[PDB]
């Protein structure tokens, strides 16, 4: 049994809710919240911008030190950093950004990072300002992630379309 409330069950392991990942993280304090990161961990907008704002910029400070030591992530890659006031850990995952011309096949690689964590609160990778089709992102999630994932979807309109169209 876990703390997550109000989710619709899509599959054995994938659950979805119309929610603000920030407000959901603040309520649940999950072991892992996933950030929709870029390779530079520059958390300027969308999921990354909102999560970072909720940490009072502590996520960005920590991220800048990570990049100065390790250099950029790979598209499709991830790193584990602090969850600050939102979660125990933040899994920063880089989905491909279609608005930069990145290969959408890297979306599966991105979701494979979730399998290293038994339970996660996450957004749909490569959705929103990353430019991918969220319907496609949800399909790749369901077909890739085997651990228990609780998806928070920002738009009520998009949420209803994801549920109605789910196979």
Ligand X SMILES: Cc1ncc(C)c(N)n1
Instruction: Tell me how far CA of residue 57 lies from CA of 6, 33, 85, 116, in angstroms.
Output: 29, 16, 11, 26
Please report the sign of the dihedral spanned by the C-alpha atoms of residue 115, residue 119, residue 120, residue 124: positive
Please report the sign of the dihedral spanned by the C-alpha atoms of residue 127, residue 137, residue 23, residue 87: negative
Closer Cβ to ligand X, 25 or 79, answer by number: 25
Closest CB 109 distance from ligand X, rounded Å: 21
**Mapping DSSP to helix (H, G, I), strand (E, B) and coil, where does residue 44 land?**
coil
What is the side-by-side strand order in the sheet with 14-18?
Answer: 8-9, 14-18, 148-153, 119-122, 32-36, 89-93, 78-82
The 11-40 site mask, x for binding ligand X (CB under 6 A), equals ---------xxx------------------
Total residues at the site for ligand X (CB under 6 A)?
11
Closest CB 94 distance from ligand X, rounded Å: 16
Closer Cβ to ligand X, 47 or 106, answer by number: 47
Closest CB 19 distance from ligand X, rounded Å: 7
Phi and psi of 109, rounded to 5°? -55, -40
- Examine residue 46 and tell whether it contacts ligand X (CB under 6 A): yes
Near ligand X in 92-131, by CB under 6 A: 123, 128
The 130-159 site mask, x for binding ligand X (CB under 6 A), equals ----------------------xxx-----
**Mapping DSSP to helix (H, G, I), strand (E, B) and coil, where does residue 128 land?**
helix
List residues binding ligand X (CB under 6 A): 20-22, 46-47, 50, 123, 128, 152-154
């Amino acid at each position: 049994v876990n703390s997550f409330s109000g989710y619709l069950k899509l599959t054995d392991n994938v659950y979805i809710k119309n929610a603000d990942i920030v407000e959901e993280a603040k309520k649940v304090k999950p072991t892992v919240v996933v950030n929709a990161a870029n390779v530079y961990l520059k958390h300027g907008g969308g999921v990354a911008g909102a999560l970072n704002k909720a940490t009072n910029n502590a996520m960005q400070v920590e991220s800048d030190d990570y990049i100065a030591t390790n250099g950029p992530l790979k598209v499709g890659g991830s790193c584990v950093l602090s969850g600050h006031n939102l979660a125990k850990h933040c899994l920063h995952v880089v989905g491909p950004n279609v608005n930069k011309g990145e290969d959408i096949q890297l979306l599966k690689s991105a979701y494979e990072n979730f399998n290293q964590h038994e339970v996660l609160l996450a957004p749909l990778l490569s959705a929103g300002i990353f430019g991918a089709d969220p319907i496609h992102s949800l399909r790749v999630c369901v077909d890739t992630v085997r651990t228990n994932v609780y998806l928070a979807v920002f738009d009520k309109n998009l949420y209803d379309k994801l549920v109605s169209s789910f196979l």
